[PDB]
Design a protein around this motif. Structure first.
Motif, PDB file in Angstrom:
ATOM      1  N   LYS A   2       4.326  19.124   4.154  1.00  0.00           N
ATOM      2  CA  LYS A   2       4.717  17.986   4.998  1.00  0.00           C
ATOM      3  C   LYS A   2       6.182  17.625   4.695  1.00  0.00           C
ATOM      4  CE  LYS A   2       2.191  14.185   3.978  1.00  0.00           C
ATOM      5  NZ  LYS A   2       3.163  13.121   3.652  1.00  0.00           N
ATOM      6  N   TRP A   3       6.988  17.407   5.755  1.00  0.00           N
ATOM      7  CA  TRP A   3       8.440  17.130   5.630  1.00  0.00           C
ATOM      8  C   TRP A   3       8.694  15.608   5.498  1.00  0.00           C
ATOM      9  CZ3 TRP A   3      10.536  21.968   5.606  1.00  0.00           C
ATOM     10  CH2 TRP A   3       9.941  22.977   6.373  1.00  0.00           C
ATOM     11  N   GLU A   4       7.680  14.860   5.021  1.00  0.00           N
ATOM     12  CA  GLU A   4       7.654  13.398   5.141  1.00  0.00           C
ATOM     13  C   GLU A   4       8.449  12.720   4.019  1.00  0.00           C
ATOM     14  OE1 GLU A   4       4.041  10.923   6.613  1.00  0.00           O
ATOM     15  OE2 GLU A   4       4.050  10.500   4.477  1.00  0.00           O
ATOM     16  N   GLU A   5       8.127  13.048   2.743  1.00  0.00           N
ATOM     17  CA  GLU A   5       8.649  12.334   1.535  1.00  0.00           C
ATOM     18  C   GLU A   5      10.183  12.326   1.508  1.00  0.00           C
ATOM     19  OE1 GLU A   5       5.812  15.109   0.691  1.00  0.00           O
ATOM     20  OE2 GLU A   5       5.246  13.415   1.924  1.00  0.00           O
ATOM     21  N   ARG A  22      14.370  13.903   9.937  1.00  0.00           N
ATOM     22  CA  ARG A  22      13.377  14.963  10.213  1.00  0.00           C
ATOM     23  C   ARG A  22      14.050  16.342  10.332  1.00  0.00           C
ATOM     24  NH1 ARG A  22      10.468  12.943  15.534  1.00  0.00           N
ATOM     25  NH2 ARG A  22       9.317  14.901  15.260  1.00  0.00           N
ATOM     26  N   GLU A  23      15.260  16.371  10.916  1.00  0.00           N
ATOM     27  CA  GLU A  23      16.033  17.612  11.086  1.00  0.00           C
ATOM     28  C   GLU A  23      16.607  18.071   9.740  1.00  0.00           C
ATOM     29  OE1 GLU A  23      19.082  19.618  14.221  1.00  0.00           O
ATOM     30  OE2 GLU A  23      19.717  17.602  13.688  1.00  0.00           O
ATOM     31  N   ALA A  24      17.162  17.116   8.976  1.00  0.00           N
ATOM     32  CA  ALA A  24      17.818  17.384   7.684  1.00  0.00           C
ATOM     33  C   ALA A  24      16.895  18.157   6.732  1.00  0.00           C
ATOM     34  CB  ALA A  24      18.272  16.068   7.046  1.00  0.00           C
ATOM     35  N   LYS A  27      15.639  21.841   8.327  1.00  0.00           N
ATOM     36  CA  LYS A  27      16.746  22.815   8.356  1.00  0.00           C
ATOM     37  C   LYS A  27      17.130  23.229   6.925  1.00  0.00           C
ATOM     38  CE  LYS A  27      16.587  22.721  12.803  1.00  0.00           C
ATOM     39  NZ  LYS A  27      17.569  22.042  13.684  1.00  0.00           N
ATOM     40  N   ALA A  28      16.891  22.319   5.959  1.00  0.00           N
ATOM     41  CA  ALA A  28      17.062  22.606   4.522  1.00  0.00           C
ATOM     42  C   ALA A  28      15.833  23.330   3.935  1.00  0.00           C
ATOM     43  CB  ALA A  28      17.338  21.309   3.755  1.00  0.00           C
ATOM     44  N   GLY A  29      14.717  23.327   4.693  1.00  0.00           N
ATOM     45  CA  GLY A  29      13.479  24.013   4.288  1.00  0.00           C
ATOM     46  C   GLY A  29      12.753  23.313   3.139  1.00  0.00           C
ATOM     47  N   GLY A  30      12.887  21.977   3.096  1.00  0.00           N
ATOM     48  CA  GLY A  30      12.287  21.142   2.054  1.00  0.00           C
ATOM     49  C   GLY A  30      13.155  21.029   0.801  1.00  0.00           C
TER      50      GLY A  30
END
Length: 43
Positions: A2-5, A22-24, A27-30
């Protein structure tokens, strides 16, 4: 997964659009350190 935290930390540091946070992260892959650059659109 999840890309949430990370995006939820990016809103805490930067009062931005949700899409920016959300994009940052995606695109950084977590990767928070790389997302820390991508979150800042100079414009």
């Amino acid at each position: 997964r999840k890309w949430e935290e990370i995006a939820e930390r990016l809103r805490e540091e930067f009062n931005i659009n949700p899409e920016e946070a959300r994009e940052a992260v995606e695109k950084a892959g977590g990767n928070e350190e790389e997302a820390r650059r991508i979150v800042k659109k100079r414009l």
